[PDB]
Curated annotation (Swiss-Prot), chain A:
Known partners and oligomeric status: Homotetramer. Can also form heterotetramers with RYR1 and RYR3. Interacts with FKBP1A and FKBP1B; these interactions may stabilize the channel in its closed state and prevent Ca(2+) leaks. Interacts with CALM and S100A1; these interactions regulate channel activity. Identified in a complex composed of RYR2, FKBP1B, PKA catalytic subunit, PRKAR2A, AKAP6, and the protein phosphatases PP2A and PP1. Interacts directly with FKBP1B, PKA, PP1 and PP2A. Interacts with SELENON. In cardiac muscles, identified in a complex, composed of FSD2, CMYA5 and RYR2.
Gene name as annotated: RYR2
Induction / repression: By TGFB1.
Disease: Ventricular tachycardia, catecholaminergic polymorphic, 1, with or without atrial dysfunction and/or dilated cardiomyopathy: An arrhythmogenic disorder characterized by stress-induced, bidirectional ventricular tachycardia that may degenerate into cardiac arrest and cause sudden death. Patients present with recurrent syncope, seizures, or sudden death after physical activity or emotional stress. CPVT1 inheritance is autosomal dominant. Ventricular arrhythmias due to cardiac ryanodine receptor calcium release deficiency syndrome: An autosomal dominant arrhythmogenic disorder characterized by syncope, cardiac arrest and/or sudden unexpected death, often in association with physical exertion or acute emotional stress. Patients who survive manifest polymorphic ventricular tachycardia and ventricular fibrillation. Unlike typical catecholaminergic ventricular tachycardia, arrhythmias are not reproducible on exercise stress testing or adrenaline challenge.
Post-translational modification: Channel activity is modulated by phosphorylation. Phosphorylation is increased in failing heart, leading to calcium leaks and increased cytoplasmic Ca(2+) levels.
Biological role stated in the UniProt entry: Cytosolic calcium-activated calcium channel that mediates the release of Ca(2+) from the sarcoplasmic reticulum into the cytosol and thereby plays a key role in triggering cardiac muscle contraction. Aberrant channel activation can lead to cardiac arrhythmia. In cardiac myocytes, calcium release is triggered by increased Ca(2+) cytosolic levels due to activation of the L-type calcium channel CACNA1C. The calcium channel activity is modulated by formation of heterotetramers with RYR3. Required for cellular calcium ion homeostasis. Required for embryonic heart development.
Residues represented out of the complete protein: 1496 to 1592 of 4967
Compartments, record wording: Sarcoplasmic reticulum membrane
Name of this protein: Ryanodine receptor 2
UniProt similarity note: Belongs to the ryanodine receptor (TC 1.A.3.1) family. RYR2 subfamily.
Domain observations: The calcium release channel activity resides in the C-terminal region while the remaining part of the protein resides in the cytoplasm.
């Protein structure tokens, strides 16, 4: 739907339910129609494909929303029951080279 | 706020991507890869 | 898209948009 494209930075939220292998997306507090169903034991890497049209392109935000654990909880087994979002030094950004 | 028991029992994880103003959203894809 | 689309002065952070080479030449000549 119709936005100003610039009132606030676009926030695309990715939600992964690993117990059911269901991938859903949120545009702006609004569930998107696109969804995916992955096969069991799939290992999914968060990914962004971008063609830069600005000095500032985008940013990963490793937070959480209501009733959902943060990404660090599933990434690290030591934080499997830690609701507080974390970005340990092991997690970093890689690019196709 | 949220339900602590549900938050502990859930296997649902979240992350987000903020596309800054001035960057064309048609040139940005967000999701997961293997 | 736009057709279907106390006081808050809040406006748009706009300086981050890019311009092509022809667009930049346009801007230069019209500022001239």
């Amino acid at each position: 739907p119709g936005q100003g494209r610039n009132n606030n930075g676009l926030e695309i939220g990715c939600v992964v339910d690993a117990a059911s292998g269901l991938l859903t997306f949120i545009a702006n507090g609004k569930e998107l129609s696109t969804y995916y169903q992955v096969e069991p034991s799939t290992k999914l890497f968060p990914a962004v494909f971008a063609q830069a049209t600005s000095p500032n392109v985008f940013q990963f935000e490793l937070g959480r929303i209501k009733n959902v654990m943060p990404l660090s909880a599933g990434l690290f087994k030591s934080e499997h029951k830690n609701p507080v979002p974390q970005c340990p030094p092991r997690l970093h950004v890689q690019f196709l080279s | 706020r949220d339900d602590y028991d549900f938050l502990m029992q859930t296997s649902t994880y979240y992350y987000s991507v903020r596309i800054f103003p001035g960057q064309e959203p048609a040139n940005v894809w967000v999701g997961w890869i293997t | 898209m736009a057709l279907y689309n106390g006081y808050s002065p809040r406006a748009i952070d706009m300086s981050n948009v890019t311009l092509s080479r022809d667009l930049h030449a346009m801007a230069e000549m019209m500022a001239e």
